[PDB]
C-alpha cells in the first residue's frame, strides 16, 4: 500500500519539524565563551608488542590496569598496562576476530567476528587456564561489537542488521533489536546500562531500551557508514564516527545532532571513538594512522596522537581517565597520558 | 627492584611471548587462500577436491593450505574484505558455461573486476578457475557465444571461445605490474587442480621472497 508509505513520509516530516523547533541555539553558540582546552600533548607511555597481525579491537578493564586486545593472528591477549606484562594469551578457534569486550567484574572476556559467534571466556578458573565459557550463536552476520552488561548478560552487534541481548548461562537470545537497514558496526552501553546506542551502515544511529527491546530514538545526519559510537559520560549524549571523515555529537533529550567534528584536510574514515572522563575531549581513530583529539564542546582539534604506522582500528579510555589506549592495524597497542 | 611475584609474572609473560613467537612462526609458513565466486560457479567442487566463514585445511607436498570460503557471509563485503589483506592468494571460480543467461558471466566479470582492483589486493595474485569445461563445450555447439560477447569475432569452437573468455578475464585487471593471474580450466578431476594451485602458490611465494630480498 502506497498510502502507508506516504504516511511514513508525513510522520518523518512531522518529527523533523518537531526537533527543528527545539533548535534555538547551537552548541557552538552556547560554548562560544568558555576558554579552549589549549593544546593536548600526549606521549606514548607504553607500547605493547605481542600481536603479530592487525589489531581490530581492545577494551579496558574496569580496574584501569588490565586490557584485552583482539588481533587477527588468532589470539586474545590480556595486558597488564602498568608493567606491560602479558597476563593471559587466549587462542581463538576462529582467527577472524572483529570485536573484544571485558566483563566489568573482570571474570570474563568476549570475542567475535566473521564466525557469527560471540565466544565467552572464563578468566578465573580453578584449573589456572582460560576456558571457553559459552558460544553465543544466532547471528547470521559477522560480530561487529559486544559489551557485557554483567557476568550473565551481553549485548552483541552483528552485520546481519540486528542487535541482540543474550543470556550467557542459557546461551539464548533474550531480546533481538531489529530496526536497522544496514550492517550494525558499533555499540555503546549507557552508564546505567538501561539502554544502548548502535551505529550501522545505513548512516543512522538508534537508541534501544534493553528492558523493552524497542528503538526509542533514531538519529541521522551522517553521509556514510557509522563505524564507531560512544555515549557521553553523562549518558545524555553520544558521539558517532563514520566513513565520511566526520564525527558528530547527538543529544538524546534534544533528539538531534549537536556538533560536527571535521576538518578540510581530513578525508578518511573514523574507526573508533571515545570520550574523556569529563567528556570535554573526544578521541577518534582514523585511517590516517593517527588518532585525533577534539574539544567536544568547541569542535576544535586539540591534539594529535601520531604513533602508529597503520590504520588506528580501536581506541579506549580508562575508567579513571588516566590513560588512552590505541590499537592499530600494525601489531602494537600504545598507551598515552 | 622487582618483587618476587613481579619476577614470576615477568617470567610468565616471557613464556607467553615465546609461545606467541612459535605460533607466529608456524602460521607464517602456511598458505592462505581466499575462495571467491559469483555464485554456484564451481566453488563447491573445488572444495570437494581438497555459520559464516568456512575454513578448509589440506596438506599437499608438505605444504599446508588454509582456504577460507566466505560465500555464506552475507553482508556488506567492503566492511570485512580488508580482513583478508595479506592472504597468500585468491582463488576465483567462474562457471565457463554461465554465459548464456541469466548475464551471469557479466556478473562474474564484475565481481572479478571489483576483487582484482580492490585496494586491499594490489599485490595479491589471483588463481582463476574456469569450471564446467564439459557442459560449456556441449553448449557452445548449440548456443553461440555471441549472446554474451557481441563483439566476439571468431569460430564458435570450444578452444577459441575458452581462450577469448580467459583473455577477457585476464584483461579485466588494471595493475598488471604488481600482481599475476594464473588461469586454469578445472574439470579434469585428476588431482590436476590441486597441483596447479600448488604451482601457483610456490611461484607467488618465490616472488614474495624475491621482493623481500630486493631482487624483484
Amino acid at each position, epitope marked *: 500500500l502506497d498510502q502507508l508509505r506516504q504516511e511514513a513520509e508525513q510522520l518523518k516530516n512531522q518529527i523533523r519539524d518537531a526537533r527543528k523547533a527545539c533548535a534555538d541555539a547551537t552548541l557552538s553558540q552556547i560554548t562560544n565563551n568558555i576558554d579552549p582546552v589549549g593544546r593536548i600533548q600526549m606521549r606514548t607511555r607504553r607500547t605493547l608488542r605481542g600481536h603479530l597481525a592487525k589489531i581490530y579491537a581492545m577494551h579496558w578493564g574496569t580496574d584501569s*590496569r*588490565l586490557l584485552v586486545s583482539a588481533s587477527q593472528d588468532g589470539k586474545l591477549i590480556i595486558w*597488564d598496562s602498568y*608493567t606491560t*606484562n602479558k*597476563v*593471559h594469551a587466549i587462542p581463538l578457534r576462529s582467527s577472524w576476530v572483529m570485536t573484544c569486550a571485558y566483563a566489568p567484574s*573482570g571474570n570474563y572476556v568476549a570475542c567475535g567476528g566473521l564466525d557469527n559467534i560471540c565466544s565467552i571466556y572464563n578468566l578465573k578458573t*580453578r*584449573e*589456572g*587456564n582460560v576456558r571457553v565459557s559459552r558460544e553465543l550463536a544466532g547471528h547470521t552476520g559477522y560480530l561487529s561489537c559486544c559489551r557485557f552488561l554483567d557476568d550473565n548478560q551481553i549485548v552483541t552487534s552483528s552485520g546481519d542488521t540486528t542487535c541482540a541481548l543474550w543470556d550467557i548461562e542459557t546461551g539464548q537470545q533474550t531480546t533481538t533489536f531489529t530496526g536497522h537497514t544496514g550492517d550494525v558496526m558499533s555499540l555503546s552501553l549507557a552508564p546505567d546500562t538501561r539502554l544502548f546506542v548502535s551505529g550501522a551502515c545505513d548512516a543512522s544511529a538508534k537508541l534501544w531500551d534493553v528492558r523493552e527491546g524497542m528503538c526509542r530514538q533514531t538519529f541521522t545526519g551522517h553521509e556514510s557508514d557509522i563505524n564507531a559510537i560512544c555515549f557521553f559520560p553523562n549518558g545524555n549524549a553520544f558521539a558517532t564516527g563514520s566513513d565520511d571523515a566526520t564525527c558528530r555529537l547527538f543529544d538524546l533529550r534534544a533528539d538531534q545532532e549537536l556538533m560536527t567534528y571535521s576538518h578540510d584536510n581530513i578525508i578518511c574514515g573514523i574507526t573508533s571513538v571515545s570520550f574523556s572522563k569529563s567528556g570535554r575531549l573526544l578521541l577518534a581513530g582514523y585511517d590516517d594512522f593517527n588518532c585525533n583529539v577534539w574539544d567536544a564542546l568547541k569542535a576544535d582539534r586539540a591534539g594529535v596522537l601520531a604513533g602508529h604506522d597503520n590504520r588506528v582500528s580501536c581506541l579506549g579510555v580508562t575508567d579513571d581517565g588516566m590513560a588512552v589506549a590505541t590499537g592499530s592495524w600494525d601489531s602494537f597497542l600504545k598507551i598515552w597520558n | *627492584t622487582l*618483587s*618476587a*611475584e*613481579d*619476577k*614470576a*609474572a615477568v*617470567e*610468565r609473560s*616471557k*613464556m607467553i611471548d615465546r609461545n606467541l613467537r612459535e605460533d607466529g612462526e608456524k602460521a607464517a609458513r602456511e598458505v592462505k587462500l581466499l575462495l571467491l565466486g559469483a555464485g554456484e560457479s564451481g566453488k563447491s567442487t573445488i572444495v570437494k577436491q581438497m555459520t559464516g566463514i568456512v575454513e578448509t585445511h589440506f596438506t599437499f607436498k608438505d605444504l599446508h593450505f588454509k582456504m577460507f570460503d566466505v560465500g555464506g557471509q552475507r553482508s556488506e563485503r567492503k566492511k570485512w574484505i580488508h580482513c583478508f589483506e595479506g592472504v597468500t592468494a585468491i582463488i576465483f571460480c567462474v562457471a565457463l558455461s554461465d554465459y548464456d543467461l541469466v548475464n551471469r558471466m557479466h556478473e562474474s566479470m564484475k565481481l572479478f573486476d571489483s576483487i582484482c582492483n580492490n585496494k586491499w589486493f594490489t599485490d595479491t595474485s589471483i588463481i582463476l578457475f574456469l569450471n564446467k569445461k564439459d557442459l560449456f563445450e556441449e553448449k557452445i555447439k548449440k548456443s553461440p557465444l555471441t549472446i554474451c560477447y557481441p563483439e566476439y569475432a571468431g569460430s564458435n569452437t570450444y578452444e577459441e571461445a575458452a581462450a577469448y573468455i580467459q583473455c577477457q578475464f585476464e584483461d579485466l585487471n588494471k595493475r598488471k605490474d604488481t600482481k599475476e593471474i594464473y588461469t586454469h580450466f578445472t574439470c579434469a578431476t585428476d588431482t590436476k587442480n590441486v597441483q596447479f594451485v600448488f604451482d601457483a602458490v610456490t611461484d607467488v611465494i618465490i616472488k614474495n621472497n624475491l621482493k623481500d630480498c630486493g631482487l624483484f
Partner: single-chain antibody, 233 residues
Framework: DVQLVESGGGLVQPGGSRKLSCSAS????????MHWVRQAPEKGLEWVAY????????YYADTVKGRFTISRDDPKNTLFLQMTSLRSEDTAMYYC??????????????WGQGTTLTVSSSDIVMTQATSSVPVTPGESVSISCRSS???????????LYWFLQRPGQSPQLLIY???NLASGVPDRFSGSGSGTAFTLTISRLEAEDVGVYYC?????????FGAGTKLEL
C-alpha cells in the same frame, strides 16, 4: 578435583637418599610454579624449594641447598624432590604446593595432602607472639603476626599470606597479600594491617575454624613462615 598427591615418604637411614613425587591432576600443571613446604612432626611450616613454570627459576632453602633437587615432568604432571645426605633434621611431612604468578593471581592456593618422611637417629623473620588462645563459637578473634622487615613493596603490594591448618589436614590458603580473600573462603575471615604489623580477624567464629594459623611472607626468598597461632575450645 584439583588434587595433588604426594608419595615416596617413609623410614630412611641418616645420610641416605630418597625421592618424593607429587602427581598433579585436574589443573594446568605446567602453568603453575610448584613449591615444597615442610612441617616437622610438632612444629610449624617451613618452605623448602620452588620451581617456576617452565623450570626457568629454582630456589632452595639455605638448610637444603646443595642436598635437595627440585624437578618437574610437565608431560607427566609430576613434581619431584630428590633428597640426598638426609639428616635427622629432615624428618617432617612434605607438602606439594601449587602457585601461579600474574597480576591479581592467588599464589599458594592449593596444597597437597602431604607425605611423611622420617629419618632415623638476612632472612625475614615472622613473629606470632600468641602461640595459643582459647576461643568460643560465636565470638570474634584476631590473630597477630609481625615481620622484621616491611612487607610493603614500592608497587603497593603487601606480600603477606595467611594459612589455616585444621587438625589432621593440609594447610589451606585464607588471605593472600594481606587483604584478598582466597577463593572459597567465607567473608568472616578478614585481613588488615600495615608494613611489619598484620592482623587476621575472624568474625562470628564457629566450628571448623580451630587449628593453627600461619603467616607467610612472599616479599623475597627464602619464604618464611610464622610460628603459628593455635585455636581451640
Amino acid at each position: 578435583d584439583v588434587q595433588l598427591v604426594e608419595s615416596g615418604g617413609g623410614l630412611v637411614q641418616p645420610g641416605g637418599s630418597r625421592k618424593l613425587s607429587c602427581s598433579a591432576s585436574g589443573f594446568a600443571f605446567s602453568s603453575f610454579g610448584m613449591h615444597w613446604v615442610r612441617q616437622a612432626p610438632e612444629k610449624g611450616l617451613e618452605w623448602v624449594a620452588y620451581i617456576s613454570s617452565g623450570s626457568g627459576t629454582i630456589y632452595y632453602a639455605d638448610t637444603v641447598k646443595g642436598r635437595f633437587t627440585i624437578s618437574r615432568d610437565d608431560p607427566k604432571n609430576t613434581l619431584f624432590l630428590q633428597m640426598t645426605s638426609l639428616r635427622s633434621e629432615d624428618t617432617a611431612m612434605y607438602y606439594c604446593v601449587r602457585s601461579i604468578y600474574y597480576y591479581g593471581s592467588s599464589p599458594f592456593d592449593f596444597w597437597g595432602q602431604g607425605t611423611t618422611l622420617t629419618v632415623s637417629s638476612s632472612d625475614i623473620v615472622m613473629t606470632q607472639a600468641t602461640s595459643s588462645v582459647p576461643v568460643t563459637p560465636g565470638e570474634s578473634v584476631s590473630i597477630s603476626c609481625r615481620s622484621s622487615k616491611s612487607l610493603l613493596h614500592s608497587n603497593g603490594n603487601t606480600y603477606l599470606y595467611w594459612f589455616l591448618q585444621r587438625p589432621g589436614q593440609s594447610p589451606q590458603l585464607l588471605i593472600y597479600r594481606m587483604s584478598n580473600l582466597a577463593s572459597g573462603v567465607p567473608d568472616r575471615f578478614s585481613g588488615s594491617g600495615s608494613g611489619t604489623a598484620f592482623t587476621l580477624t575472624i568474625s562470628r567464629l564457629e566450628a571448623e575454624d580451630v587449628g593453627v594459623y600461619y603467616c607467610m611472607q612472599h616479599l623475597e626468598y627464602p619464604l618464611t613462615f610464622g610460628a603459628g597461632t593455635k585455636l581451640e575450645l
